[PDB]
Short mmCIF file of C-alpha atoms in Angstrom, two decimals:
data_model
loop_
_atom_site.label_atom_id
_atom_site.label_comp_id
_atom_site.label_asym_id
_atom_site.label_seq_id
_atom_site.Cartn_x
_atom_site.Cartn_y
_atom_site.Cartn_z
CA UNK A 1 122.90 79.16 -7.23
CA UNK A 2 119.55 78.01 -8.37
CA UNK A 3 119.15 74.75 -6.82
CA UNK A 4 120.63 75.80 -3.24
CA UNK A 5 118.40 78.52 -3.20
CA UNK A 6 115.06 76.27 -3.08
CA UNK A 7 116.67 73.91 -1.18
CA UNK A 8 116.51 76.82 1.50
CA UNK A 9 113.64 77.89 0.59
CA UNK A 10 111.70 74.44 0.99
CA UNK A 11 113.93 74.03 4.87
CA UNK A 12 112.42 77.47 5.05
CA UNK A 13 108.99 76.89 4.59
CA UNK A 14 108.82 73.68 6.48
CA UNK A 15 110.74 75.51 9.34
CA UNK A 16 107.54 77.99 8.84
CA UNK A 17 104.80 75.25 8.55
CA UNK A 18 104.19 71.46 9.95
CA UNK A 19 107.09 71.99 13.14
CA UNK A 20 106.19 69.55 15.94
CA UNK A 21 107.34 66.34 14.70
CA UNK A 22 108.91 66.70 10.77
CA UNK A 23 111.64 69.45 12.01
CA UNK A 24 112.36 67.56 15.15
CA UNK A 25 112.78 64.56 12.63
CA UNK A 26 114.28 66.98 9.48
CA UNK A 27 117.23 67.32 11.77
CA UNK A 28 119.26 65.32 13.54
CA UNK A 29 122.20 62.50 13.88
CA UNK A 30 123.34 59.60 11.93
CA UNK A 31 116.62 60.04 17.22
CA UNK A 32 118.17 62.79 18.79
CA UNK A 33 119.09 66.10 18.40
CA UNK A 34 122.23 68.32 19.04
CA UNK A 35 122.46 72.01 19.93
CA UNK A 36 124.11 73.50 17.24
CA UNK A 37 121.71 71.66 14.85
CA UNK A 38 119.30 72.80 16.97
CA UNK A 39 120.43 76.87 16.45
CA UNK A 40 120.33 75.99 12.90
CA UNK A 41 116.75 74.80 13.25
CA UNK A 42 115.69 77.57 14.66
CA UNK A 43 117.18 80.22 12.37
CA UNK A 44 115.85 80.48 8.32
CA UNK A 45 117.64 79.96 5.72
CA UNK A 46 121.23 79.07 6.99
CA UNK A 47 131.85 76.33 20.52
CA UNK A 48 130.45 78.98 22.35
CA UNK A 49 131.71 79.17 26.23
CA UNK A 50 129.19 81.48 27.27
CA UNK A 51 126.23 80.42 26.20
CA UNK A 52 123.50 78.26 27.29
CA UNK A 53 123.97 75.89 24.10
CA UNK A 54 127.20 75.37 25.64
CA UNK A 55 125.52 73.94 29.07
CA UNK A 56 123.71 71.27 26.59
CA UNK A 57 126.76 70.44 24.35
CA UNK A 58 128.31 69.36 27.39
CA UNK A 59 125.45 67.39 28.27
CA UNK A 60 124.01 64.38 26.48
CA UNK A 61 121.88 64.79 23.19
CA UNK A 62 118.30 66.50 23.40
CA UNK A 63 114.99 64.69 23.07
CA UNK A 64 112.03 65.39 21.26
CA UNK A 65 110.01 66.32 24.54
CA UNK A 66 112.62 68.87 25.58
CA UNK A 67 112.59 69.91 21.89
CA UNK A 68 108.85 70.96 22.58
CA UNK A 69 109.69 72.14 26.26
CA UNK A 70 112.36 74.93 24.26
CA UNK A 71 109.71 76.01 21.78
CA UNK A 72 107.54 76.59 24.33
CA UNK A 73 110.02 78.54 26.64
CA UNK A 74 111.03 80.92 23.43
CA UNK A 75 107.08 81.28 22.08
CA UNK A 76 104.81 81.92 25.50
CA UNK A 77 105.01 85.54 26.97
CA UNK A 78 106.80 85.79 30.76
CA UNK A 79 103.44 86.34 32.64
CA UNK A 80 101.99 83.38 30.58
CA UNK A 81 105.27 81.20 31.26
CA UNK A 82 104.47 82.33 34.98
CA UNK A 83 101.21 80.48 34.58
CA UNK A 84 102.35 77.66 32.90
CA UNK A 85 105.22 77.17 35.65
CA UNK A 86 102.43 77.37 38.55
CA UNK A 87 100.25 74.70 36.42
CA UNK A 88 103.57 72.18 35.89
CA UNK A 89 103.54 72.08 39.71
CA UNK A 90 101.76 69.93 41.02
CA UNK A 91 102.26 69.51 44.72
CA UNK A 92 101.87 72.64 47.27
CA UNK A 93 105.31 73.82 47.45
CA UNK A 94 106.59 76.39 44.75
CA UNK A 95 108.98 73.67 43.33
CA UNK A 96 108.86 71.22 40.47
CA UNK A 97 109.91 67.82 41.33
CA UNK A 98 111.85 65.30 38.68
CA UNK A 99 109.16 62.87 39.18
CA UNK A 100 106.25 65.64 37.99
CA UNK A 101 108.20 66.96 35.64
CA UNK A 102 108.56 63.87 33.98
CA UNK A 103 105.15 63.12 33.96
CA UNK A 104 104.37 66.23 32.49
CA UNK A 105 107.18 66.22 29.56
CA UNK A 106 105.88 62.56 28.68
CA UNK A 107 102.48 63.77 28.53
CA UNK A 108 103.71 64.78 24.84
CA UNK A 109 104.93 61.20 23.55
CA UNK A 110 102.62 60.72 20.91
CA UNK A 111 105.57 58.84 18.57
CA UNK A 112 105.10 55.72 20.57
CA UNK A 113 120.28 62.32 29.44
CA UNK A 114 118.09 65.56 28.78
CA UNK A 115 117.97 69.05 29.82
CA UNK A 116 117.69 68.08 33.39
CA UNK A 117 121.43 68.16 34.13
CA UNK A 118 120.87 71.86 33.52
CA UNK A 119 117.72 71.84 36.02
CA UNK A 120 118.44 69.23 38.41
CA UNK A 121 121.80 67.90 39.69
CA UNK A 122 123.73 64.93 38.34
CA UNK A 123 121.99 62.68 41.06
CA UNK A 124 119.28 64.30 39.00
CA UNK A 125 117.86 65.42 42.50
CA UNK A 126 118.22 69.41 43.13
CA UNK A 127 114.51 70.48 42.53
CA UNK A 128 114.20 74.55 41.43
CA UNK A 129 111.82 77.36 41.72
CA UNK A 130 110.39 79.96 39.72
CA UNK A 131 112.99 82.66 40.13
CA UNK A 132 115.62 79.97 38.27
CA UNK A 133 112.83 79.34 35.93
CA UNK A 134 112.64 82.81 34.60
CA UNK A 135 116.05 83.43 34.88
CA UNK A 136 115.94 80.37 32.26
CA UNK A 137 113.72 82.10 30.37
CA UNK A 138 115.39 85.18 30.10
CA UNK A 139 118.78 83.72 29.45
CA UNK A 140 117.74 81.37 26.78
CA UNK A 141 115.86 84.47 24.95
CA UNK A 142 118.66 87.11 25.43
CA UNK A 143 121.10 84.59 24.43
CA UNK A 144 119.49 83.34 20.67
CA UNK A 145 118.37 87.48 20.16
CA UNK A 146 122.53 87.51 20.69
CA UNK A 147 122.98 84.92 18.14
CA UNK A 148 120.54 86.55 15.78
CA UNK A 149 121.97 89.69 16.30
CA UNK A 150 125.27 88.66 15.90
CA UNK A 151 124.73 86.51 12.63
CA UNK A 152 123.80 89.71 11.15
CA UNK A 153 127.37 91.34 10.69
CA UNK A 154 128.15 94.02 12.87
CA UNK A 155 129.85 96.92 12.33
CA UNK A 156 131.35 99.04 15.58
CA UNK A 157 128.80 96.73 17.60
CA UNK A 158 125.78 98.05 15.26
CA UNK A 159 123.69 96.66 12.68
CA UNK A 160 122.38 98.90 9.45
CA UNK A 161 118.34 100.13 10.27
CA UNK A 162 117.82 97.97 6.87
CA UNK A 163 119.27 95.04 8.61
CA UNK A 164 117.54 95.49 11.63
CA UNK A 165 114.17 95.99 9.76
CA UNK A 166 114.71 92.91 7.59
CA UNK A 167 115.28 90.89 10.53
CA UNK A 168 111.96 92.81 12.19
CA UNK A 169 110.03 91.43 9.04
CA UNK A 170 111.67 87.87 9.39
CA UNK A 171 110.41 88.13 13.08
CA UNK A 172 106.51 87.95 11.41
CA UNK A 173 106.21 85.31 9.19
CA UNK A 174 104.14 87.16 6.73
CA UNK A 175 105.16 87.49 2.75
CA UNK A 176 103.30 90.64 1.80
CA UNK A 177 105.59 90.60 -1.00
CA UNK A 178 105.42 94.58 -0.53
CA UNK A 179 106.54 95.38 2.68
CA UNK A 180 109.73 94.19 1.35
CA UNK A 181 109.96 96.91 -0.80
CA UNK A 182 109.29 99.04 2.52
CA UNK A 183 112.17 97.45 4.14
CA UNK A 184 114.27 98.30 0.97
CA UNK A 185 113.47 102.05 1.00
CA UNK A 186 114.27 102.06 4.66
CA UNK A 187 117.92 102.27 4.15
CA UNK A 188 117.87 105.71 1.65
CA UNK A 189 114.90 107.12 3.76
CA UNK A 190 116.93 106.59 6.80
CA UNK A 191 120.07 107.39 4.67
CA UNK A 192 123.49 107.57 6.61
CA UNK A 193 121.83 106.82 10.04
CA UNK A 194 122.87 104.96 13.24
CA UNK A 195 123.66 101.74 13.99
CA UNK A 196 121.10 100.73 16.05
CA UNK A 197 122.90 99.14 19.63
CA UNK A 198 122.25 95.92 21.08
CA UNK A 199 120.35 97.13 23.95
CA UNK A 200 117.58 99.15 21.75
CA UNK A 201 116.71 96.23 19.49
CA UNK A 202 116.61 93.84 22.58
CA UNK A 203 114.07 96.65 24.07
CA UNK A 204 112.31 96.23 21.05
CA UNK A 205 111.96 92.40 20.32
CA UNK A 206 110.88 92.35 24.14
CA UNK A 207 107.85 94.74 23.85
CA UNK A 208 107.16 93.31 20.52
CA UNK A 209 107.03 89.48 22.93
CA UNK A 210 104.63 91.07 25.42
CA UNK A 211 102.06 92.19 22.96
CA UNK A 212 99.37 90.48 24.08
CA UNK A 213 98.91 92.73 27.04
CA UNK A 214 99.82 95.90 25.48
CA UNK A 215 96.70 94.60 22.78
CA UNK A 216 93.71 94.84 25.66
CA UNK A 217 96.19 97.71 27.55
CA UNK A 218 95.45 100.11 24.66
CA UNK A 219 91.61 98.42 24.14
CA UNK A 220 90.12 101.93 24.62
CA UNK A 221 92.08 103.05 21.15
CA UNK A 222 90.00 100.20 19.44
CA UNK A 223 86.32 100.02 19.67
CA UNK A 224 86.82 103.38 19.31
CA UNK A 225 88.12 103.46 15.53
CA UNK A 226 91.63 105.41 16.81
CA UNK A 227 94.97 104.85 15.68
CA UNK A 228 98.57 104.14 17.28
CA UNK A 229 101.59 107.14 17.27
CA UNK A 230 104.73 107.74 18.30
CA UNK A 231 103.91 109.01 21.99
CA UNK A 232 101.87 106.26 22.95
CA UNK A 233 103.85 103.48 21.49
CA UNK A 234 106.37 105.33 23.79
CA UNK A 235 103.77 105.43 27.20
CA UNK A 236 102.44 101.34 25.85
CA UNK A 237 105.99 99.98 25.98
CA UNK A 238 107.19 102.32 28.99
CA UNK A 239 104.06 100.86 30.84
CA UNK A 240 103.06 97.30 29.74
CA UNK A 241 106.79 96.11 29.07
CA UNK A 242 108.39 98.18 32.24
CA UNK A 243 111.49 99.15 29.14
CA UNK A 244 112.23 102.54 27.32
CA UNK A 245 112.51 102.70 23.50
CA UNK A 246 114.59 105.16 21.90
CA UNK A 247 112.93 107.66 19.90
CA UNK A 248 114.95 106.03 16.84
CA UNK A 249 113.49 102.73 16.95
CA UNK A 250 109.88 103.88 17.21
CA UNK A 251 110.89 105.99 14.21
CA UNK A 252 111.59 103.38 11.69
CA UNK A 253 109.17 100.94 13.24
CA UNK A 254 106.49 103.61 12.21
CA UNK A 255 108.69 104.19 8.65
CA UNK A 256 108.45 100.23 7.85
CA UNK A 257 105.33 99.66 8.63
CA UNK A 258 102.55 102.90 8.40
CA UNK A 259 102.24 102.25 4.64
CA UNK A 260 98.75 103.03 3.70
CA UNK A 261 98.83 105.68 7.18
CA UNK A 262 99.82 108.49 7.15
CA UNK A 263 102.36 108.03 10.49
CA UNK A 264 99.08 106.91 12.59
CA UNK A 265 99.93 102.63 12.46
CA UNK A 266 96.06 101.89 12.61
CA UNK A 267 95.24 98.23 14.07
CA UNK A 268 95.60 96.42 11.06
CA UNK A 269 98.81 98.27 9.94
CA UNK A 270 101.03 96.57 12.89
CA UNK A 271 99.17 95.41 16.16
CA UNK A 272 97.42 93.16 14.71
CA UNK A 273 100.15 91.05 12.81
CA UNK A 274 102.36 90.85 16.18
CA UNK A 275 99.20 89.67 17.64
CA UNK A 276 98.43 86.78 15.10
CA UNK A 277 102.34 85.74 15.01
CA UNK A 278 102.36 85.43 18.53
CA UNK A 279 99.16 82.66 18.02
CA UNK A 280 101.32 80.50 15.90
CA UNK A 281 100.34 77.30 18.25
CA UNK A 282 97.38 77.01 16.25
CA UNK A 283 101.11 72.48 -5.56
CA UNK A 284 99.08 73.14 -1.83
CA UNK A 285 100.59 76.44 -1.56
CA UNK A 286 97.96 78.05 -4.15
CA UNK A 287 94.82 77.00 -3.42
CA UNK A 288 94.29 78.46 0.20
CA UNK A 289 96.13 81.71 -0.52
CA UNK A 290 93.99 82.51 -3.41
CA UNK A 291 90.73 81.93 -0.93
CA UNK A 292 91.78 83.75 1.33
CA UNK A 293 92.71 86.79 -0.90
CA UNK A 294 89.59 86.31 -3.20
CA UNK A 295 87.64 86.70 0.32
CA UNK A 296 89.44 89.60 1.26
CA UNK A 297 88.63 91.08 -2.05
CA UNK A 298 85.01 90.52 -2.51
CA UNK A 299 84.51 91.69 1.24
CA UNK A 300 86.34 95.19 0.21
CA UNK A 301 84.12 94.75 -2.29
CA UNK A 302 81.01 94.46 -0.77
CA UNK A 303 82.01 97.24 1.87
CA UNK A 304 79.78 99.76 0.57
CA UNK A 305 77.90 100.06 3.39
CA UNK A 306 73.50 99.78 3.40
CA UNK B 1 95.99 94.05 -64.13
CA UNK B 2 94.38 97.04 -65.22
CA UNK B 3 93.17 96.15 -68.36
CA UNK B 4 91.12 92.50 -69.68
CA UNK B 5 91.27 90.23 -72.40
CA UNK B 6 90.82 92.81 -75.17
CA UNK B 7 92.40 96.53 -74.61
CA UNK B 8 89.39 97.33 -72.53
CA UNK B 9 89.80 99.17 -68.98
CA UNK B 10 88.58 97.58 -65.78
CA UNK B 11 86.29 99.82 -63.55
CA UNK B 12 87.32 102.42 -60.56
CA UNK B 13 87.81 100.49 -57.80
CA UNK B 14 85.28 101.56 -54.47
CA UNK B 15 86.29 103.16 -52.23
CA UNK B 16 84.85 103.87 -49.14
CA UNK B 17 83.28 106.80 -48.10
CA UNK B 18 85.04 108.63 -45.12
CA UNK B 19 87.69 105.84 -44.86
CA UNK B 20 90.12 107.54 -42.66
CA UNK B 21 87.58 109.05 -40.39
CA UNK B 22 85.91 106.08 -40.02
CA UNK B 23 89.45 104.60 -38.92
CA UNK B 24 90.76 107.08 -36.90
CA UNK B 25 87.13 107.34 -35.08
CA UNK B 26 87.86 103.38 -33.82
CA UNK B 27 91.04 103.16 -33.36
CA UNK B 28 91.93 106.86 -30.70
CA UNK B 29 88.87 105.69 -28.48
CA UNK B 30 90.64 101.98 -28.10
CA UNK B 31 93.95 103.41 -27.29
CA UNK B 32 92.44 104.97 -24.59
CA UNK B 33 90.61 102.61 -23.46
CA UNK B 34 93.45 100.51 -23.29
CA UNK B 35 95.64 102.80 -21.65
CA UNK B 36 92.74 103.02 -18.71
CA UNK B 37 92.49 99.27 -18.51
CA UNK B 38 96.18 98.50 -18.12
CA UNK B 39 96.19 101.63 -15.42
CA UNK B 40 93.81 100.11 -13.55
CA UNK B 41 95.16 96.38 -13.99
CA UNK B 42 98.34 97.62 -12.65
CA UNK B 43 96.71 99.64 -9.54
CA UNK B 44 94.99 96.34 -8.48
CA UNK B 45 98.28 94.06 -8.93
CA UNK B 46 99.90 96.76 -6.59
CA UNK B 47 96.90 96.30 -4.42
CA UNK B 48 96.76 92.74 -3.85
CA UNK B 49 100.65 93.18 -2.60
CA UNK B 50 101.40 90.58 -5.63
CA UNK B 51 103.43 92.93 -8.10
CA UNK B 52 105.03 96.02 -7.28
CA UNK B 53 108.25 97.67 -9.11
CA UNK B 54 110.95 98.89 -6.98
#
């Protein structure tokens, strides 16, 4: 199907670009939103009684502000979230009121019955502190990595490395147009491998969230023209993250991505793409592209030194 | 035709001298060259990430 397909790819890219207020308004009933449309919002190109979208099916229909509130929670790093937790508090005590919070998730009505049944109590009273906060966190995160993982088909409770490295490569939004062809040799390079459990690629996606501390953790190995390996990715995630990787994972991290290496993963090669994906808070699609690759050109170019 | 009005015969045709040397020493040289300028065309479409055959 022909037309289907760019109708998913144009939800796609304005899934990828322009989010705040044309998704929120791209999707939902008949102002509000609903959970399940809001799982398909959040996943490209495509009831529970465990999951946290359950606790908000059984509660009224989301708004916009606790729309932004969810992005937030999935995009900011835990000892970021941390930070923006102690800022939402205003008063003294190490608890968020209703009335602050309010204030603080109308701050972001610009266009001018929520999550707080999940927060508060149904006298919309019971105020809560930071350890249900990150357990919030953590839930919500585990829970849509489930979903993702599980959309993928499993077989025996395990997902092909191909699979796994396609979805790794969704993670970034970045069409090299190459590094698919990476992802495609993966599977004979890696041929009749394992299945690659839940718990490693959860290990995995959660390093890959806390990057921006393992960046300045490992700031000796720049400014000093070194390059990543297998080892140290191994010491950076056992230290920065506080979870082991299996030697498996590292493996066909380094296989998708050390393409022009040589099995070093320089800066450029990976660090520095998790690093500007994680900054995504700040005919058209020609003219900008072609700059930007014209620049990067001429400056290769150019780099031949005094 | 190869003769005119009356029965008379029409003149040997020129011919050029060292035709298909002077041919052959134009036309090797281009292949080449063409062969090194679609090489490299190709290496820089694989190096812009825009085209690459898998």
């Amino acid at each position: 199907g022909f037309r289907d397909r760019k109708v998913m790819e144009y939800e796609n890219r304005i899934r990828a670009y322009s989010t705040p207020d044309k998704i929120f308004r791209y999707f939902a009933t008949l102002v509000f939103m609903t959970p399940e449309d809001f799982v398909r919002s959040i996943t490209p190109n495509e009831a529970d009684e465990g999951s946290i979208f359950y606790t908000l099916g059984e509660c009224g229909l989301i708004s916009f502000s606790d729309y932004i509130f969810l992005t937030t929670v999935l995009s900011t790093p835990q000892r970021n979230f941390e930070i923006a937790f102690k800022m939402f508090d205003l008063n003294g005590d190490g608890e968020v009121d209703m009335e602050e919070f309010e204030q603080v998730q109308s701050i972001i009505r610009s266009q001018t019955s929520a999550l707080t049944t999940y927060f508060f109590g149904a006298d919309l009273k019971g105020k809560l502190t930071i350890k249900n906060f990150l357990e919030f966190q953590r839930k919500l995160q585990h829970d849509v990595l489930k979903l993702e993982f599980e959309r993928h088909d499993p077989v025996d409770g395990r997902i092909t490395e191909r699979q796994f490295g396609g979805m790794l490569l969704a993670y970034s939004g970045v069409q090299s147009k190459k590094l698919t062809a990476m992802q495609r040799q993966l599977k004979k390079h890696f041929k009749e491998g394992k299945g690659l459990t839940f718990q490693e690629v959860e290990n995995f996606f959660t390093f890959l969230k806390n990057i921006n501390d393992v960046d300045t953790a490992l700031s000796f190995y720049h400014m000093a023209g070194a390059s990543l390996d297998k080892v140290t990715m191994q010491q950076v995630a056992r230290t920065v993250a506080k979870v082991e990787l299996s030697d498996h994972v590292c493996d066909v991290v380094f296989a998708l991505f050390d393409c022009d290496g040589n099995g070093e993963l320089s800066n450029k090669e990976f660090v520095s793409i998790m690093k500007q994906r994680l900054m995504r808070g700040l005919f058209t699609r020609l003219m900008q592209a072609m700059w930007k690759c014209a620049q990067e050109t001429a400056w290769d170019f150019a780099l031949p030194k005094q | 035709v190869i003769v005119t009005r009356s029965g008379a015969i029409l003149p040997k045709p020129v011919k050029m001298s060292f035709g298909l040397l002077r041919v052959f020493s134009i036309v090797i040289p281009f292949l080449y060259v063409g062969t090194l300028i679609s090489k490299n065309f190709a290496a820089l479409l694989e190096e812009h990430d825009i085209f690459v055959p898998e």
